[PDB]
Symmetry: C2
């Protein structure tokens, strides 16, 4: 659409044993989202109990990793930026504004 | 947008101890989605290990419960339709077509 609003967030992630950074990434210029064709790198999963939980969220668009742009990059290039990170990875993301409802009932 | 494609699915859910149907519902005419204003009843969570897992998915739009339309209804009316169901609830939903990417990397 033409009316999307995104909020930028910066986080510094740390590796943990048996999780790594505890995220999955999808997307890339060579790996577009199936229906929309969007080429952004996207956080497609955040592992429960992992070091990214409460920092990054599923569907965050990744803008930068350690000062390197993720706009229009190969998926392998995004993976390589995280692979070469040491203990820490500075990640800048964009998150869709708002979300949710006033009331939610579990049954 | 004007180009959305949805696929209809019908499921019959059964209650289980400590889960109920194992879903959360949000939405309704009196409880619209915050940013879009959408009034649909929506499955906003599906409990892991619960009886709806692999049947319904987060973000399914609920069209009917036991033959009763959920289009333009109060949130409490949707809740009441499920409350009054016995062991079984026949639910018709609409699910956004497609989704996902060819490649996903966990790290």
């Amino acid at each position: 659409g033409s009316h999307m609003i995104w909020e930028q967030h910066t986080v510094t992630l740390h590796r943990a044993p048996g999780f790594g950074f505890g995220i999955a990434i999808s997307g890339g210029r060579d790996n577009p989202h199936f229906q929309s064709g969007e080429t952004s790198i996207v956080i497609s999963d955040v592992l429960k109990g992992g070091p990214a939980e409460g920092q990054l969220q599923e569907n965050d668009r990744v803008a930068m990793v350690n000062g390197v742009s993720m706009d229009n990059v190969e998926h392998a290039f995004a993976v390589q930026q995280l692979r070469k990170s040491g203990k820490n990875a500075k990640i800048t993301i964009r998150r869709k504004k708002g979300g949710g409802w006033r009331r939610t009932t579990y049954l």
